[PDB]
Ligand SMILES: Cc1ncc(COP(=O)(O)O)c(C=O)c1O
Ligand SMILES: Cc1ncc(COP(=O)(O)O)c(C=O)c1O
């Protein structure tokens with residue numbers, strides 16, 4: 001039962017469909033052999049966009065882009081492209097802090113809100129100033145298990161790292177001005193990073209941008225200004241095809257809110273363990289819980305027993321400590337329930 | 349089917365097969381595309397992949413091996429940001445060298461000490477490397493024009509080289525190079541990873557301005573996993589190195605490639621429907637460009653459609669040079685080269 005935090009569990013169909021490492025419709029040639037300038041690859045790029053557009057209900061005026069280099073690279077690109085004079089951020093955890101520290105290296109960043117004080121266990125109240133160039137959030141804070149589940153109304157363009165909770169439920173794209181997400185958690189395999197960007201926001205920055213970091217260039221060249229990560233992109237295509245096949249994001253959410261409901265319920269009733277985050281702000285993707293009072297013991301005791309019973313990748317981040325159950329889309333109800341019983345049977 | 353694609357390109361079958369890890373990498377039971385990059389399983393493969401690379405290419409101590417996303421094209425920026433303190437010098441031997449220059453120029457003062465532009469990049473120009481510049485950048489094999497610098501250069505200033513098209517195509521004295529980078533998708537493995545071998549000594553000499561994600565020093569410190577790397581692409585590199593080693597290492601590779609090129613250049617020369625575009629001396633062993641002779645006999649359809657019919661793919665040239673281009677990287681076999689030879693020959697009207 002893989003609760004890995006990213007890369008993570010993946011729907012079998014999607015891993016199997018990637019039999020295109022063996023024969024893609026070249027004909028006869030591996031997907032890893034085919035030219036990205038081939039009409040065969042171009043179709044797949046268009047097809048993947050079309051589907052993404054369909055699945056996420058992306059309105060006209062937004063462009064879809066596939067980049068290597070991970071979300072971490074995007075921390076820089078959003079800043080270089082949209083931080084003209086001043087930008088504002090919301091510090092809800094490690095990834096958010098990383099985003100900020102990058103932005104701070106390119107221009108003036110104002111952190112309007114921070115949950116640092118109480119160790120990132122909650123999502124802080126904040127006010128978005130209307131005179132800043134853009135507002136950046138981190139929808140789901142993968143390490144702490146906090147999440148902003150409602151789409152936000154900004155007056156300034158909204159930018160959101162959804163690495164951990166993109167494609168986990170339906171959303172109003174029209175509120176976001178730039179969404180980006182490493183593929184490796186919910187979208188697909190590592191090695192590609194997705195950017196859905198409202199092209200309108202772009203050319204407003206004073207002048208200083210390298211060609212390779214310039215959203216406008218990539219857009220111009222249909223995300224193939226240079227050689228994209230074909231194989232990873234192909235996982236995204238398949239993953240989108242899967243989501244669609246199983247009722248799209250509406251059904252996805254049902255499965256995810258149930259998975260998260262049951263798991264939070266367990267932690268709450270079971271009194272070996274205690275959840276770390278404020279109920280109201282609980283993540284539906286990354287579920288963090290610690291030993292209860294105390295040390296009863298985390299040590300070895302919950303962990304080794306879990307391992308034995310087949311539960312992998314639930315050890316928490318060093319900073320929060322304790323445990324973390326990453327339950328992305330591909331993580332099944334059965335597995336969550338396997339971890340529920342594991343926790344329950346451990347109860348002494 | 350004979351794949352002369354320019355990148356991505358032909359790949360050894362063992363390497364595409366080995367990538368059965370998509371189905372089941374160690375784990376146990378989990379796909380390579382599911383495994384954590386922090387896992388001890390993946391960390392071994394990174395180390396193994398470095399160790400092998402170090403072994404195959406004979407990398408001396410002091411040099412750090414790094415896998416990046418984003419292509420060589422990102423590397424165009426990164427070298428400049430990381431090494432261009434006050435002034436740099438570059439050698440314009442074609443499209444890719446030009447692209448490298450234009451990026452560098454966006455960061456700081458760049459001097460182009462040499463250019464083969466004048467005669468449409470058909471030759472490699474004479475040059476003198478100033479000892480006072482922060483680094484010298486070259487593009488060893490000019491993938492679009494079919495020129496190549498086959499001998500390793502002695503700088504004084506640190507040498508930087510885009511070997512996308514001819515890395516791992518023969519042995520080389522790494523000690524002459526200060527920073528090597530190459531997109532994987534031509535000789536090293538699948539697209540989606542870009543390799544960097546860099547002499548860490550050269551680094552911290554730049555004033556001061558570098559984003560975390562673009563900082564070779566940061567990536568070095570975190571063993572190339574500061575952020576999530578391209579697991580699957582990296583794997584293909586691990587396998588490709590394994591394959592190279594398996595077949596006698598770079599020494600044997602060179603033998604195959606030089607013969608492949610010789611035979612094909614020999615056909616182009618004898619056959620007088622076609623004519624090679626580049627000065628013999630500077631002929632690329634990796635990317636072989638030829639045009640119709642005199643003229644238009646006709647490139648048109650005539651050589652092209654017939655070739656397609658006969659199973660030859662990806663030989664159509666770049667728009668700028670026109671004509672044709674036969675990319676014959678490591679994974680391209682002597683059989684394929686000879687099948688294209690015969691096609692050309694039999695077509696002799
Ligand atoms: C919310 C969030 N943003 C960004 C990232 C960074 O992803 P990458 O490794 O592609 O930089 C992560 C990685 O886990 C994450 O959880
Ligand atoms: C010499 C050279 N440089 C740069 C590139 C660009 O690689 P990418 O598109 O991955 O940046 C190529 C691609 O073929 C190449 O042969």
Ligand SMILES: [Cl-]
Nearest residue numbers: 093094095143
């Ligand atoms: Cl976080």
Ligand SMILES: [Cl-]
Nearest residue numbers: 442443444490
């Ligand atoms: Cl070139």
